[PDB]
Amino acid sequence: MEAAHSKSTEECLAYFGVSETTGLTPDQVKRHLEKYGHNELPAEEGKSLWELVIEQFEDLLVRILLLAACISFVLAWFEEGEETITAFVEPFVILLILIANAIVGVWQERNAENAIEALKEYEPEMGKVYRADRKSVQRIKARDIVPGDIVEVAVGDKVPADIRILSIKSTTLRVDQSILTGESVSVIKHTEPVPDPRAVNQDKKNMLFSGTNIAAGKALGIVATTGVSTEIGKIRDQMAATEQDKTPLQQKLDEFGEQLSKVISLICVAVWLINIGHFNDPVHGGSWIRGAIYYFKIAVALAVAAIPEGLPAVITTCLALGTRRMAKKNAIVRSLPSVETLGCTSVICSDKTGTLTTNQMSVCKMFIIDKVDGDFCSLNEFSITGSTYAPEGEVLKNDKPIRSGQFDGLVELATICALCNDSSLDFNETKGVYEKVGEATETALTTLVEKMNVFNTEVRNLSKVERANACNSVIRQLMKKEFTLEFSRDRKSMSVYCSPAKSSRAAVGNKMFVKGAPEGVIDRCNYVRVGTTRVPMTGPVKEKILSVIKEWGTGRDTLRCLALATRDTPPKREEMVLDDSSRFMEYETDLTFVGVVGMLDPPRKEVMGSIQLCRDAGIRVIMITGDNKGTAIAICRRIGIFGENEEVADRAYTGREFDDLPLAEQREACRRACCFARVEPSHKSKIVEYLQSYDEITAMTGDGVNDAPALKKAEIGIAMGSGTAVAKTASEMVLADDNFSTIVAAVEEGRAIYNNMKQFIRYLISSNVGEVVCIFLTAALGLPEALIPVQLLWVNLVTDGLPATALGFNPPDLDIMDRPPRSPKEPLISGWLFFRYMAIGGYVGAATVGAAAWWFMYAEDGPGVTYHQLTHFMQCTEDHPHFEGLDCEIFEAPEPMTMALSVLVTIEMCNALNSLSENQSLMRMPPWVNIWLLGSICLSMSLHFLILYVDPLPMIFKLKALDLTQWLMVLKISLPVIGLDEILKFIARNYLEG
Ligand SMILES: [Ca+2]
Ligand SMILES: [Ca+2]
Ligand code: NA
């Protein structure tokens, strides 16, 4: 649709043939989407520096490698010598392996695109519309909104696509077009057409331009244009693919690739140079070319082995799957470039209500008198689980569940809470959640009796709507309330006068149930209830009761307490003044103390644990609440932000106090603050500013238009899944949960994703490092070369493939939240890490050149055994009186090479087990933790076996099956690679971090 602003509502509806009371049909949507595409901009090409300096470079290499092989394949024809056979299939074997490499490459790239695809499911559905499907509004991804269907916009929403306003349901509809036209001053709309077709957006006040925000009202409309066809998309098209920007990690990675592209090139060009003295050997026929050709094939083959392939794919895969787990836990992170930042979070500033706290008053403790003797009493104390108004949870005594019917005192406690109460519960079928009806403080009582269920009423098989007030009803049917003595500030308590239900004894069994602040109520009690009996109140008894009420309203929980009492013999109704509350205290006298309930707005699920996790991880937690300072502090001791007894009159501030401080102090307050109470919305921005001024990577929560600035400023802006869309747009994450615990879990995944990358890099670099020195360890010394081209390619295929990919699937480390947050500034590879690389490799490199030299030096039950100089072996055909019964060509035996290659392979398969964790000993993180890794180790081992025990093969790669005795020589030479690293792990896990 075009110029919809010019046409009328009727015209626009006719354009796509749709009534605003039915909406687009399935047939229509299918076609329109096909014809108009999705509502979004095109994804820009992703040709990184790594793809050109690494990926493209290795491709070229393997081509010229095959080319070198074909050159000599042709020269092997003009060779009047004996028609060889092994070097005759070389060109074929090379092309073959290269195919295998490709198979693995596509597999990895397919995992990545598939992992990415599985993400579209969790993308936020910011867009409501009416389609012929349902006769009720429907939610859908903004990208799935095709021009034509009917959309519904409301307050605090973001315009998904360009829409022509059809009907304004509210009295007025204001919009914020600042993002495009140029002004935050909301604009008024109408549904009339704008005659001038060539008019500016600021004049098309009958259209809702995508990317704009609703300042007020509700409206119905029809989609005119989507995607880049958008009015904003045609301004955002100037930023479409014309850009130059990369995340801090991408810059480090490219810097790494570019520097690897140099190290490999050099060391390899060096291999061909330090061997020019072998271009004329007899084993090459004495050709100054065929010899240079042979080594060129090694220098390029070593390069291929060296180069760590599959990085982009593995990283993208870890990142994509990692983000899935986040969404699986309600952490919705749209921008992948954000998880990097998320992983470095060092400060989380969180609102209290609904995020740290449930905001649903709950009774968690209660007590009744147990026994009374000698004017002293013991108490029956109980705790109740469950943290919402929902009738779910149980009563416990000494942490063991008990039935409340078992204590007659509790039956009366429940009676009183069910009757002295003007509230009720209600299950909202829409939201599928229990909600309160009336004061939260009373509903906590309603919900408590539901959990108590003193008369063991059957509810397990009841409806969610019936269950809501089930138990309260049972009680209301046994007792009839005839009137209420309204709460009075004079006495701080209230009461209900009741009588037995369906009772014919009008003047028999009448009671008054009292609830109120502890002091006044306790003071008007001359009796104490014990089970169903009553004994006089005594000082000691009154003192005990009051002390536990102190402990509760003072301890780390600061529970709000209510005393519940009963006037056993209430006055006659005829003798009660019902219009003068100042007379109520008297009517509520001569009471019998029954019990005390202690309630609070409890922490959300896992919040308290998540907070300890934060502290363990060096992540500061800052609470922002509306409560007064004194209570905010209470709430912080309660959830764990502040210790039970910890001076915090320096880490908590009200906006009043904060505003009274000068710039340097305010900033100073933020480097150490843990709590901000009664604060202004403009304060969140200052807080973020000051935090950032200390290099803290900041996460800030928000849910309204007033929070957008701060969520934008913050490195990790966190919007409530239940808040306005304006906030969500301005953020890096959305809590589908609204739960603070979900933020901490997201930070954890972020750290986890980073690690897998590092472990992935360590294995590939440490291993391949040795491969390189190995070739040099024999060249520098002078020993006989232990690896030929096809052998190098074989190691590559077997060690840089599936095994490495598998590390991408490594579980979360164990000390992941026991380390401080990573600094975006620190280098990709720390000096200690580079040492850990040059150490693990330095070994495998020698453990290989040595694995073959062993066959020649201190051989065991095997030939050769000339442990003297092998250095000048190129002189065995110059002075043979040095050997004792063996042919010089013994150095050309496939025995040695079969060892070096079998060690080089099994050892790297071992080093892969060292990469299951960064610092955790295989003892703590068993190798069977990554099943995929083990499976890859098999496949790799099987293939190496097949390449040895399948007659045709062993001749191709110049090898020979080794007996059960020669294999154990590999292990005793390979297993120590674990030991070596396992030691370094001890060094770091103990002397470096701790
Ligand atoms: Ca490689
Ligand atoms: Ca390797
Ligand atoms: Na932000």
From Swiss-Prot:
Chief localization = endoplasmic reticulum
Binding-site list for Ca(2+) 2: N768, E771, T799, D800, E908
Name the cofactor(s) required for activity, per the record. Answer: Mg(2+)
The residue spans the entry assigns to the Cytoplasmic side of the membrane are as follows 1-48, 111-253, 314-757, 809-828, 918-930
Give the reactions, separated by semicolons, that this protein catalyses. Ca(2+)(in) + ATP + H2O = Ca(2+)(out) + ADP + phosphate + H(+)
Provide GO CC annotations from the record: endoplasmic reticulum; endoplasmic reticulum membrane; endoplasmic reticulum-Golgi intermediate compartment; H zone; I band; membrane; perinuclear region of cytoplasm; sarcoplasmic reticulum
Q: Which residues bind Ca(2+) 1?
A: V304, A305, I307, E309, N796, D800
Task: State the source organism's domain of life.
Answer: Eukaryota
Q: How is its activity regulated?
A: Inhibited by sarcolipin (SLN) and myoregulin (MRLN). Has also been shown to be reversibly inhibited by phospholamban (PLN) at low calcium concentrations in vitro. Dephosphorylated PLN decreases the apparent affinity of the ATPase for calcium and this inhibition is regulated by the phosphorylation of PLN in vitro. Enhanced by DWORF; DWORF increases activity by displacing sarcolipin (SLN), phospholamban (PLN) and myoregulin (MRLN).
Disulphide bridges, residue numbers: C876-C888
Gene name, per UniProt, is ATP2A1
Which SMART domains would you find in this protein's record? Cation_ATPase_N
Please tell me in which tissues this protein is expressed: Skeletal muscle (at protein level). Skeletal muscle, fast twitch muscle (type II) fibers.
Task: Name any Gene Ontology BP term.
Answer: positive regulation of calcium ion import into sarcoplasmic reticulum
What are the alphabetically sorted keywords of the record? ATP-binding, Calcium, Calcium transport, Disulfide bond, Endoplasmic reticulum, Ion transport, Magnesium, Membrane, Metal-binding, Nucleotide-binding, Phosphoprotein, Sarcoplasmic reticulum, Translocase, Transmembrane, Transmembrane helix, Transport
Instruction: Give the subcellular location.
Output: Endoplasmic reticulum membrane; Sarcoplasmic reticulum membrane
What ranges are annotated Lumenal (topological domains)? 70-89, 274-295, 778-787, 852-897, 950-964
Q: What is its EC number?
A: 7.2.2.10
On whether Translocase is a keyword of this UniProt record, the answer is: yes
GO molecular function list: ATP binding; ATP hydrolysis activity; calcium ion binding; P-type calcium transporter activity
- Protein's recorded name: Sarcoplasmic/endoplasmic reticulum calcium ATPase 1
CDD domains the record matches? P-type_ATPase_SERCA
Q: Which family does it belong to?
A: Belongs to the cation transport ATPase (P-type) (TC 3.A.3) family. Type IIA subfamily.
